Amino acid sequence: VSFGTPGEEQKASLPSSDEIIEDFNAIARGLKLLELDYLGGSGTRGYGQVKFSNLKARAAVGALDGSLLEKLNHELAAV
RNA sequence: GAAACUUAAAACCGUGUUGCACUGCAACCCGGAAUUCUUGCACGUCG
């Protein structure tokens, strides 16, 4: 979570706390699509069925906003 | 007046550092995007 690459004609800013929910919602939506798919190989002949378990988020560097880490753990609760 | 060289001999020479102090130095990601994937019954034949 940082400024990123702002571009030559823009005013740089940090992503709001509403935008971090929409990033984590697309991660767990893309991890539920992988449980129907097969992660490399033959796949259509029965290979590579995969499963996720115990997905949880932390804060490794720096503090968060407050009551935000627990609602990022709820987007990951449905895989 | 006609007749007898202010001539002869003598180095503008001897000694002496264009020498002493001084960083081609400070700042800079060989970095950003990309599924070793697509098709395939361990099966057929019996005086």
Side-chain angles (χ1 to χ4, degrees):
Chain A
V1 181
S2 61
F3 281 98
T5 301
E8 200 63 78
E9 298 296 314
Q10 212 256 344
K11 206 267 180 182
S13 61
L14 289 166
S16 63
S17 78
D18 204 14
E19 198 175 316
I20 319 180
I21 312 295
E22 302 176 11
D23 298 337
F24 274 66
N25 183 80
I27 292 174
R29 175 151 33 90
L31 291 180
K32 272 191 289 297
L33 286 167
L34 195 57
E35 305 192 287
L36 301 180
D37 282 287
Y38 46 83
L39 200 62
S42 299
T44 64
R45 271 147 283 162
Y47 283 33
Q49 204 222 343
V50 98
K51 190 75 186 68
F52 286 95
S53 37
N54 306 281
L55 299 187
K56 52 178 59 67
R58 299 195 304 113
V61 160
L64 276 178
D65 184 275
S67 74
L68 183 58
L69 188 62
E70 61 168 352
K71 65 166 60 70
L72 292 174
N73 277 113
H74 192 260
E75 308 293 305
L76 301 175
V79 189

